[PDB]
Write a protein that binds this ligand. Structure first.
Ligand SMILES: [Cu+2]
Ligand SMILES: [Cu+2]
Length: 421
């Protein structure tokens, strides 16, 4: 039971876990009703029109960066019923991820991954970064600042463009300096991609109509792995890209793929990161954990009355698994660092979650999305916490027939094809 309350979107606000909140970094926004489904994790059942200036409207008319795959529907997720299903759909996916040993570990790491209190211009003091807070409206009408790790919110203009975003700092690269920052994941449980089971077909841009559907639990789990990296500040700079030499169509298109994506998928795709540069990243981020201990040791007092210095030093020693000594100074044990680092980068992978979900999934990040379907995972006759679409004791249990969009017709409505374009 990862979510204690079965939230209904129309549930009255209480100012604790059902409240209207504001995103401080946005700067200008009307309060939005949010739901805290777990310690440090909120769900905003709304379209994301706040987290960036250049996307205030849900209209397909931008010249920023087009993509072969896209779908738009400015009215999606606007009615209260759809927001209720969005909140119920995201909840069921969290529980599905939580019912697996791999997902339970990931979510534990996400809750522990508290963004670092490294925003003090006086190294003798520990102070929060305002990037990692939300403003909750209390019953008296006033605002209350609240730290959180992860925020799940509806997609922006392009409905199927699922990203993980975080607000930046003046100088610090929070997602790549070990500090970490509050992550916002644009996600929707009401859509899912289609893919081909054959590798020759799934990696060819002119073949396949998307026979099989992607289990949205893997999709969310994929995005959680990104947040896991960025909550611990070990995300690889997106400029570090890998040019695919093993695909004739990728090669003829010059399309790159970031190391962060190849790492997040894991399995056979992570090989494309040579051993040389893997130790390059491992050592680099390990040194960033030194500064955190160096900063953590110079801290003699704490700013604010939220928590005591000793409690914040303990939470950061639990997060980064610091090696605590009789003197009280914190250090980084390389043996313990490599375990946490390997846990976040090599254990939490899309490939590994496919093994625990017992589902069919595309075999490589270097494929061509075939189609996008419309789904509804809320009803138990459609989707379950423990089986997804492959419902047990039905004709959908074997051969991933639940994911077979041709055999499980009532659960998938093709909205748009991607092959040929
Ligand atoms: Cu991301
Ligand atoms: Cu990714």
């Amino acid at each position: 039971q990862f979510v204690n309350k079965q939230f209904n979107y129309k549930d009255p606000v209480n100012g604790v876990d059902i409240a209207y909140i504001k995103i401080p970094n946005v700067g200008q926004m009307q309060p939005v009703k949010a739901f805290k489904i777990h310690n440090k994790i909120w769900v905003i059942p709304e379209r994301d029109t706040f987290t960036n200036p250049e996307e205030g409207d849900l209209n397909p008319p931008p010249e920023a960066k087009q993509v072969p795959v896209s779908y738009y529907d400015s009215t999606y997720l606007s009615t209260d019923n759809e927001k209720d299903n969005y909140l119920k759909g995201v909840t069921k996916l969290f529980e599905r991820i939580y019912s697996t040993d791999l997902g339970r570990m990931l979510l534990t790491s996400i809750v522990r991954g508290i963004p670092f209190w490294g925003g003090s211009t006086i190294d003798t003091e520990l102070k929060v970064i305002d990037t990692n807070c939300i403003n909750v409206i209390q019953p008296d009408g006033s605002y209350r600042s609240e730290e959180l790790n992860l925020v799940i919110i509806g997609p922006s203009a392009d409905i199927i463009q699922f990203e993980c975003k975080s607000f930046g700092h003046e100088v610090l690269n929070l997602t790549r300096n070990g500090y970490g920052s509050t992550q916002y994941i644009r996600f929707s449980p009401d859509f899912t991609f289609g893919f081909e089971e054959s590798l020759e077909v799934d990696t060819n841009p002119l073949l396949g109509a998307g026979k099989f559907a992607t289990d949205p639990a893997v999709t969310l789990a994929h995005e959680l792995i990104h947040a896991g990296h960025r909550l611990y500040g070990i995300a690889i700079n997106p400029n570090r890209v890998f040019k695919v030499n093993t695909n004739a169509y990728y090669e003829m298109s010059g399309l790159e793929v970031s190391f962060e994506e190849l790492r997040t998928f894991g399995g056979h795709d992570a090989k494309f990161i040579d051993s040389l540069q893997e130790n390059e990243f491992r050592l680099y981020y390990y040194n960033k954990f030194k500064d955190i201990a160096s900063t953590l040791n110079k801290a003699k007092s704490i700013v604010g009355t939220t928590a005591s210095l000793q409690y914040m030093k303990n939470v950061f020693k639990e997060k980064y698994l610091l090696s605590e000594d009789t003197s009280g100074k914190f250090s980084v044990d390389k043996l313990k660092f490599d375990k946490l680092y390997k846990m976040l980068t090599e254990i939490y992978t899309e490939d590994n979650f496919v093994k625990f979900f017992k589902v069919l999934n595309r075999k490589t990040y270097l494929n061509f999305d075939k189609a996008v379907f419309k789904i509804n995972i809320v009803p138990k006759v459609n989707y379950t916490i423990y089986d997804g679409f492959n419902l047990r004791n039905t004709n959908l249990a074997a051969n991933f027939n639940g994911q077979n969009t041709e055999i499980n017709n009532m659960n998938f409505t093709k909205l748009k094809n991607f092959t040929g374009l």
